[PDB]
Amino acid sequence: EEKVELTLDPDTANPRLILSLDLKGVRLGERAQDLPNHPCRFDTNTRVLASCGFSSGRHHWEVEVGSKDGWAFGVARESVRRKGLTPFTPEEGVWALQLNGGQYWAVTSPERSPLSCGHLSRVRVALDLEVGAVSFYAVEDMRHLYTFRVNFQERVFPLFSVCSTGTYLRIWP
Template identity: 45%
Template sequence: AVTLDPDTAHPKLILSEDRRCVRLGDRKRPVPDNPQRFDFVVSVLGSEYFTTGCHYWEVYVGEKTKWILGVCSESVSRKGKVTASPANGHWLVRQSRGHEYEALTSPQTSFRLKEPPKCVGIFLDYEAGIISFYNVTDKSHIFTFTHRFSGPLRPFFEPCLHDEGKNIAPLIICSELQKSEESIVPKPEGKGHANGDVSLKVNPSLLPSQDPELFPLQDTIVSWPSDLVPALQGLKAPSF
């Protein structure tokens, strides 16, 4: 399961004890200024390093009005202002306001979602060069990046500013028990890879055509069972 790496967290971010939740604090914490830590971009990386295989995780965003999620290269700059783009090792999607979203391409790709997701699914297929985002709430495809990856990749999380008190809730990484009963990918098969995740077989019908460089949302609906259980049913409040 994906967890947060406290050594990469910006000083204003507060992580829960189980390292599954992150929220923005009111002030910077006295933490070591190590080379891995972001000092300008208010974000945190996952502890996992992905160098092969397929991986899937879900993040509960709830009623947040702004957030940034995705994957980045381990080699991205942690110091100073950074322009997020695939060319710089970032594959990220952002909620900017209301039903408006952006894929942080260059230039940015803007689109709207019919229903704002309360939970976002992120799927990475390293060998196929695919990073896909899904709305777990209405079972729809949001966006897909394609890229020829090299080097380790890591999950990326940014809870964003408080937005006048409307965006104070944390981002929460769903545990295995909290994930949807039927996820974007089938249940794991085979033995685990060296980086800790199991091999997953992906139904090709769930992925868009791989001809373009990237894919904005086009009302693509993922075919999931009708009895899908909400991803965060019974979620307990995190302990910060």
């Protein structure tokens, strides 16, 4: 495995997202800003990717999470569709945990998988492109939250999404 230092890619970010100056934190603003046009920019779903993706090996990072509904995070295949409304599902190229309806989910499809995992504050995401897995652990005790098994066929990026104005995600040092 290998610890990675990530920064958010502001050209992928939906123009409603508010990114911290240091490119670690993301929240949802009210209304879009007039940001420059790029094919990589999510124009409808409230998503942003890190600037660095991974094509081989094992990598991990940590994400600090808000306590209110609206976030989801994990990884996305590079080919995830950027223009138009997409489903937030594995078949559309996102593998993520989510806080929605007051509880945590692994976003499996067609039915999400509810978790019983206490309160999440910081989460370790561990991407293994050797065996084909993405796993999530609560940092404070390394308790296993969920593993998706996927034999990835392309470059995979850290993924963050915030669809409600009262919460946040932050890449954590």
